[PDB]
Amino acid sequence: PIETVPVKLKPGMDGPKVKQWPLTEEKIKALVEICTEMEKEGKISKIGPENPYNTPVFAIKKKDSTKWRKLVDFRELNKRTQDFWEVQLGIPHPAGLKKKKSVTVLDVGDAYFSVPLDEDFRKYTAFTIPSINNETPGIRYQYNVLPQGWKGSPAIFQSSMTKILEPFKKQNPDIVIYQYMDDLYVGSDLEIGQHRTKIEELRQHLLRWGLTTPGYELHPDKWTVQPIVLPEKDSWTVNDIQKLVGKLNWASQIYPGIKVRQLSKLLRGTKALTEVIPLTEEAELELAENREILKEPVHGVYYDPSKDLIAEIQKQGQGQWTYQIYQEPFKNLKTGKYARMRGAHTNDVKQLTEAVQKITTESIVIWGKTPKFKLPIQKETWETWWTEYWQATWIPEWEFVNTPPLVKLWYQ
Template identity: 35%
Template structure:
């Protein structure tokens, strides 16, 4: 096991006294399986013998595939471990990949099991393989690699892989290198450049002990990445199966969570999804009863085909990025996109932006919502590109905007420091028609 070039930082602990939780008795068949799984990890160098004063139970479960998985109950260990924070606030957006740039995607194999745990922390993750009737001394082991279920394992995984990739970033500064957990994407202006970077990338990973899954190296479109399909110019979501049976608030939250995650790609407006949002209201107990109303069922029927039919685009670097503000059903909606009259479809949507679901607002309060949406769109552009959009197009008349700007502190704050262009006429496009006839009461 390698990893000397990026030594894993030590964990910080809230207690000095060891934690010992006795192992659980296991039936004979599971005990045999547990011993086999432990031997596999020993053979691969993931475990080592232990005499640690720390101990937490281990067990094994059968996955849907029929294979067995070794698990350790680390709840008490996690409770006395200091959190390391978050390195990535979210996933990288593939819409920022320049159009037609060739792409290489690499998946790391068993990422946690290839990253060394700091030697000082290994004794904290010790466990015991029990024996029946205490017939012999139990065998004890501790992890040498990041344990599954350890609170800080995801953060340490991100940190370690980023360290391994740091040399690639420096050597190829013009390449786009996206890294999220065990998924790595590289894009370059030409295929020749991609061929030059590929061996350097693989060597960097291998030199740090990270293993690439050969069957998951993708070099041709469509590239599958973080549950989307990347084409030369467009990006579509992979198929998503929605929960059809909603019986509790927890079920409803999971359903709405998946759809909310899809919204930036699908353009599903707040008004469209309102029947689903209504399911979240009421008693806050996760087990409290819920059921799909006919209206909510209809929304699901509309969302499912939208996943396969709708798309967003990869960015065209030579075209300015514009924020289009629309107001479908008085729910302001933003589009971060690009416009070019020479394109077959002149509007290339990079991402949809929405405000949180809230009750119907009057026209008087609409500029307050537009101001919040402008802030959210500008913040998202900074996250995606590091710069403001070049233009913001509002669905209002110039005189309405001027009056509101003078009298509305929220609108002034939303546009503070904006040096781009503000215009007041949405171009003709089916995705922008929803705002054409809105009249504002001032």
């Protein structure tokens, strides 16, 4: 007996109709067990083909969890409700979260199951469970409460959420707390022990309200950037200077102060690539000045809350991956590199999956948004394996690119 906040799709827009993809035996068994308890608890109830809407479902294990977690891919539904959360009930983003020495992430999705869901909206949460070898037709469900991974669930629950938060917020007025989807981000500058302790107290607050909590520890102040860097060589071959001029020429699309003239002067003839070229004094200084400009920040790059974040990733090899986050081309809000991630030197898809997860997390902490990824992978390759390695409760938007590397700008 609680009022159900009415929910509407964006205007002139129809519900998600997205085919369910094949699932492994372990994932189907996990979902069947999860859903059956959910049906008995009344969170979901079976439905039929009259409901034309469907969203894909699968299961994941969080890092070190060993326990199956139901994950619904609501990306299509969320875009069709996109106006609702941003315009009306959106959570504000604490610009201070990225500055905290430690930030812990808690899965509070279970709480959303408390509140019920608008009777008129439930038709859009439909998801089908497949069977191995198609022994059975699809077992369809729909949600009676606030679904985990929908963008309405934190927004509608925010009024309830803040009241539960309000005692703890007043007992620790400098601890920053942020809510993105099923997760609670809790940052503090305390020492490690105090921080983890304070985390338990927040867990107790949820417990008395009746929400079970199963957390990731971040350190946004540790987070660094990966600037463009020019090599350091005792002697320079023609090929070396040719590589350098092309890099610099591309870099000049970002830092307009780059100059190649004095370095081009070294290439004047028609020379063998391995011929050694001494650098002139004028080139040495031009190369010096450039190395400084690349330390500098780009002119007039700032975040625009209206624009979308775009993330690009490059596979550098030997387990090394570089990324840039931006909104307008060549104006990069952040650039970074990852190395020695899980699956390094054995599995590219696992490494790409990890990197996507890390980058998304950083963007949530920093801008409170997930970027749209440009993924350096074939579409068929990614779709086959990505769910195997996914350990997160959200799913960003992505697209697939094939751009071979004319220049190694981002990584030496």
